[PDB]
Amino acid sequence: MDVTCNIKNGRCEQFCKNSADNKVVCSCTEGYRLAENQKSCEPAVPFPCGRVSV
Amino acid sequence: VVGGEDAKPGQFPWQVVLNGKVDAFCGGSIVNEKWIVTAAHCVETGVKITVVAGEHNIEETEHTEQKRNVIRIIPHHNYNAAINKYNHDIALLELDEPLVLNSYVTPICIADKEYTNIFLKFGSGYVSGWGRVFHKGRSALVLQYLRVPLVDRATCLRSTKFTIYNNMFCAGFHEGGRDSCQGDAGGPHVTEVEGTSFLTGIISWGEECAMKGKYGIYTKVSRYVNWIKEKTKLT
Amino acid sequence: SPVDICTAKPRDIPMNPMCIYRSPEQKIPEATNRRVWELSKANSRFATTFYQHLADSKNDNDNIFLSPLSISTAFAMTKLGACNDTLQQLMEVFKFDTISEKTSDQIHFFFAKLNCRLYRKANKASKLVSANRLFGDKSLTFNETYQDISELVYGAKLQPLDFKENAEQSRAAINKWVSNKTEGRITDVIPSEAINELTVLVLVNTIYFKGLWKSKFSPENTRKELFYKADGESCSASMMYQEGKFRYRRVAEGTQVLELPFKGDDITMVLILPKPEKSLAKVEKELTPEVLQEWLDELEEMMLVVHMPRFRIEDGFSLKEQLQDMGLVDLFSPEKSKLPGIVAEGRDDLYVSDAFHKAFLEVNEEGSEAAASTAVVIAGRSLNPNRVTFKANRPFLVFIREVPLNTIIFMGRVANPCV
Numbered sequence: 060m061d062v063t064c065n066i067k068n069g070r071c072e073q074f075c076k077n078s079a080d081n082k083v084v085c086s087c088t089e090g091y092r093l094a095e096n097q098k099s100c101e102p103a104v105p106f107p108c109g110r111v112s113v
Numbered sequence: 114v115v116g117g118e119d120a121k122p123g124q125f126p127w128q129v130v131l132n133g134k135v136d137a138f139c140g141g142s143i144v145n146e147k148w149i150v151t152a153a154h155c156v157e158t159g160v161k162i163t164v165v166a167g168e169h170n171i172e173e174t175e176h177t178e179q180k181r182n183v184i185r186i187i188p189h190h191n192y193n194a195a196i197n198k199y200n201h202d203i204a205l206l207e208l209d210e211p212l213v214l215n216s217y218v219t220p221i222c223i224a225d226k227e228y229t230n231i232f233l234k235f236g237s238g239y240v241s242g243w244g245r246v247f248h249k250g251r252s253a254l255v256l257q258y259l260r261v262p263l264v265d266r267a268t269c270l271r272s273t274k275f276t277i278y279n280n281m282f283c284a285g286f287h288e289g290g291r292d293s294c295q296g297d298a299g300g301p302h303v304t305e306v307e308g309t310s311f312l313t314g315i316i317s318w319g320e321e322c323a324m325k326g327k328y329g330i331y332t333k334v335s336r337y338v339n340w341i342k343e344k345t346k347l348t
Numbered sequence: 349s350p351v352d353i354c355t356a357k358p359r360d361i362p363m364n365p366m367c368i369y370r371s372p373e374q375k376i377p378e379a380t381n382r383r384v385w386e387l388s389k390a391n392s393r394f395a396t397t398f399y400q401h402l403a404d405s406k407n408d409n410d411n412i413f414l415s416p417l418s419i420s421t422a423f424a425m426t427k428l429g430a431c432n433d434t435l436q437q438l439m440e441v442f443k444f445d446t447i448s449e450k451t452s453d454q455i456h457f458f459f460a461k462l463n464c465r466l467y468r469k470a471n472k473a474s475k476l477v478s479a480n481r482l483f484g485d486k487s488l489t490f491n492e493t494y495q496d497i498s499e500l501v502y503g504a505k506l507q508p509l510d511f512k513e514n515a516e517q518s519r520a521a522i523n524k525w526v527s528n529k530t531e532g533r534i535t536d537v538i539p540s541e542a543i544n545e546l547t548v549l550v551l552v553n554t555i556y557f558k559g560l561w562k563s564k565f566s567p568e569n570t571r572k573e574l575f576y577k578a579d580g581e582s583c584s585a586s587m588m589y590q591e592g593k594f595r596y597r598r599v600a601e602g603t604q605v606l607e608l609p610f611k612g613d614d615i616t617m618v619l620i621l622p623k624p625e626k627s628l629a630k631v632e633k634e635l636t637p638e639v640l641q642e643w644l645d646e647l648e649e650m651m652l653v654v655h656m657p658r659f660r661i662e663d664g665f666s667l668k669e670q671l672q673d674m675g676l677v678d679l680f681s682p683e684k685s686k687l688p689g690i691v692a693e694g695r696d697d698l699y700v701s702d703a704f705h706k707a708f709l710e711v712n713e714e715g716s717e718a719a720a721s722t723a724v725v726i727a728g729r730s731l732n733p734n735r736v737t738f739k740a741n742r743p744f745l746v747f748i749r750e751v752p753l754n755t756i757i758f759m760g761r762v763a764n765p766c767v
């Protein structure tokens with residue numbers, strides 16, 4: 060192996076999908092955008108779901 | 114919630130309370146500005162419901178509350194109280210005026226069925242609500258929350274003579290003392306992933322509350338995510 | 349002999365009155381003496397009429413609590429020695445005039461029998477203490493046969509006191525006797541200046557009651573909640589709460605009727621809570637024995653949530669004016685009173701100067717732990733918006749009765765449970 064969604068979730072903060080030849084495609088839920096690192100998820104709206112902001 | 118603790122204002126911004134002929138009879142979760150997800154046994158078509166988001170203390174004014182009237186009640190199509198008041202225990206409520214999202218009013222995230230189940234299997238979720246703090250006791254004034262561990266199916270089936278369908282999961286403590294209770298149904302069971310909370314279950318039923326050898330039974334949300342997304346789409 | 353009144357027969361201790369009265373013209377309870385039952389029924393007829401007169405003499409904003417049975421028994425002790433018009437009025441006012449001849453002639457004995465029965469049952473379902481006695485001026489010579497009968501059926505002989513020359517000391521003595529006998533629970537039954545040098549005979553009947561619930565309230569569920577008084581104001585009361593199966597019924601105009609039993613089930617408390625907007629005052633005047641009994645017959649056991657405040661009511665009052673308005677006149681008249689059975693007819697007048705009652709009710713969470721239910725059933729976690737709720741956060745009426753007999757032992761009004 061090496062890089063599959065099956066190991067540490069492809070390093071994806073949220074969602075992972077196996078691409079071909081040792082690569083994965085990370086993704087986030089609504090209200091979020093894949094960060095610069097192509098692995099993390101960052102707020103794309105003022106109040107994204109599931110987060111405490113108080 | 115029995116044996117839980119006081120939430121802090123804004124700690125569970127997706128939590129809402131449902132008020133009817135009796136106040137705080139059930140809870141719910143914000144899907145988006147116009148929709149709430151709750152338990153089907155909490156609602157009846159044609160019966161009015163008021164939703165309050167941004168709620169903390171149900172007997173005081175915090176200036177964070179947003180009250181809305183429900184204009185459409187959608188129990189899951191497979192729900193049928195006559196053939197069990199708790200299988201497919203999930204329903205959607207459409208609000209009259211959209212909620213205004215802010216720090217005290219924020220939706221809960223809902224992943225696809227694959228990940229919702231993966232998150233549930235992380236084994237630890239949070240339940241919250243204004244339900245009773247003691248079996249047959251008083252409803253909470255301040256929102257309560259409790260961390261509950263997932264209980265393997267084998268163990269649950271053996272803990273009750275009642276049927277635990279594939280659309281349900283069990284969570285709680287073998288020793289008793291902490292559990293969701295009456296008044297909490299419809300509220301969320303969420304799993305926090307890297308700071309982002311996802312809806313993994315709906316508080317549904319049990320045999321009394323917080324009793325030794327008994328667990329809270331929850332609606333397995335992964336099985337209904339497609340239906341939720343389809344019905345609540347504003348797009 | 350050491351006769352035990354509670355297991356005695358009228359013939360065991362001959363105690364016939366000097367004069368007897370003869371009028372011009374549901375099913376019996378289980379294991380019950382019919383004579384005791386007819387006496388209990390008479391008390392209820394008296395109770396409803398007396399309460400109306402009492403309420404009228406009080407302010408609707410104040411609490412009320414009394415034992416009509418205690419009052420009926422006390423005056424039956426004057427009946428024992430009364431004659432002519434004094435006797436007739438006593439019989440009519442207390443509704444004794446309809447009972448059978450033997451029960452009437454031995455009425456003081458059957459009251460003892462009735463009180464014996466109720467005390468036995470109450471003593472296992474609550475903390476109940478009482479102190480009853482007649483006090484007369486020392487200058488008079490009391491009929492010793494009356495004194496012997498009184499000691500047996502009433503628990504004490506009439507106590508001679510020097511009202512003429514030591515009124516204040518006499519007052520203190522009476523209050524001390526009552527306090528001492530009620531373990532300090534009932535104090536100052538006779539207020540200052542209530543008796544003086546012209547006082548001849550006074551009746552004193554006092555009682556304290558603190559029941560033990562069959563299904564107790566858990567203290568963890570008691571918290572401060574607002575109680576809305578009739579004066580438009582609200583106050584902070586300690587409100588008990590519990591969910592359980594209780595006999596209940598919502599009657600005409602939305603009035604809620606709830607029965608909460610005490611240990612043993614024989615003695616219970618009945619609460620009458622009118623809907624908001626319907627004054628309790630209206631329900632008091634608008635309610636005859638028939639109606640109340642009808643409601644009690646319609647009660648059905650059902651799961652509900654009960655909110656009830658924990659409180660204490662101390663109610664002490666003179667009975668003279670109210671009874672006179674009800675028709676009891678001669679007994680309180682120096683010239684008209686005829687009580688030859690207590691003091692032989694003579695130059696000195698023997699009449700009742702006044703009668704004092706003081707009742708104390710205490711209500712809290714204490715009682716037996718709720719019985720564990722062994723019914724395997726699924727419980728949805730909704731609170732159930734269609735559930736029945738009895739929230740006593742506004743004025744309500746209270747009744748404490750013995751179920752089989754249907755005896756009204758205590759009755760009252762909780763207008764303000766706050767401190």
Ligand SMILES: CO[C@H]1O[C@H](COS(=O)(=O)O)[C@@H](O[C@@H]2O[C@@H](C(=O)O)[C@@H](O[C@H]3O[C@H](COS(=O)(=O)O)[C@@H](O[C@@H]4O[C@H](C(=O)O)[C@@H](O[C@H]5O[C@H](COS(=O)(=O)O)[C@@H](OC)[C@H](OC)[C@H]5OS(=O)(=O)O)[C@H](OC)[C@H]4OC)[C@H](OS(=O)(=O)O)[C@H]3OS(=O)(=O)O)[C@H](OC)[C@H]2OS(=O)(=O)O)[C@H](OS(=O)(=O)O)[C@H]1OS(=O)(=O)O
Pocket residue numbers: 356357358359360378379380381382383384385448449450451461462465
């Ligand atoms: C002119 O007519 C009128 O006057 C005459 C003469 O009166 S006088 O003597 O005062 O001058 C009356 O005739 C006299 O009175 C009779 C009467 O029945 O009253 C009779 O009384 C004597 O005998 C009866 C019967 O005894 S028994 O052994 O056969 O049962 C007795 O009454 C019984 O008392 C029982 C008791 O223990 O209290 C009752 O038990 C039931 O209730 C108890 C619980 O009581 S409680 O509710 O207070 O707690 C329960 O125990 C827990 C029992 O459980 C078993 C119950 O029994 S059960 O079957 O229900 O389960 C009996 O209930 C049936 C009750 O039956 C009547 C009476 O005791 S008393 O009631 O306390 O007075 C007893 O009195 S006595 O011993 O002192 O005499 C007299 O017999 C001698 C009779 O005298 S006579 O023969 O010379 O005439 C007239 O009454 S009557 O017409 O005969 O009925 C009277 O008519 S009227 O009433 O004026 O209209």
Ligand SMILES: *[C@@H]1O[C@H](CO)[C@@H](O[C@@H]2O[C@H](CO)[C@@H](O[C@H]3O[C@H](CO)[C@@H](O)[C@H](O)[C@@H]3O)[C@H](O)[C@H]2NC(C)=O)[C@H](O)[C@H]1NC(C)=O
Pocket residue numbers: 362363364365366367491492493494688689692
């Ligand atoms: C002191 O009190 C006594 C208790 O009442 C009283 O004795 C009772 O007196 C009556 C009559 O005075 C007796 O009944 C007799 O009289 C009636 C009617 O006059 C007759 O029809 C009856 O047959 C009967 O003979 C009671 O029987 C009697 N009871 C008892 C024994 O105490 C005294 O008279 C009182 N003392 C005085 C004289 O002042």
Ligand SMILES: *[C@@H]1O[C@H](CO[C@@H]2O[C@@H](C)[C@@H](O)[C@@H](O)[C@@H]2O)[C@@H](O)[C@H](O)[C@H]1NC(C)=O
Pocket residue numbers: 367368431432433
């Ligand atoms: C008081 O009563 C005396 C006796 O009256 C008779 O006996 C009583 C027990 C009743 O049965 C009554 O109907 C009988 O007439 C009278 O002699 C006496 O005058 C009365 N005193 C008054 C007028 O107050």
Ligand SMILES: *[C@@H]1O[C@H](CO[C@@H]2O[C@@H](C)[C@@H](O)[C@@H](O)[C@@H]2O)[C@@H](O)[C@H](O)[C@H]1NC(C)=O
Pocket residue numbers: 525528529530531
């Ligand atoms: C005070 O009371 C003493 C005992 O009275 C009895 O016991 C108390 C606990 C109550 O139950 C009461 O009803 C009983 O009568 C008497 O021994 C004592 O004499 C009384 N005080 C005096 C001197 O009058």
Ligand SMILES: [Ca+2]
Pocket residue numbers: 168169170171172173174175178
């Ligand atoms: Ca609030």
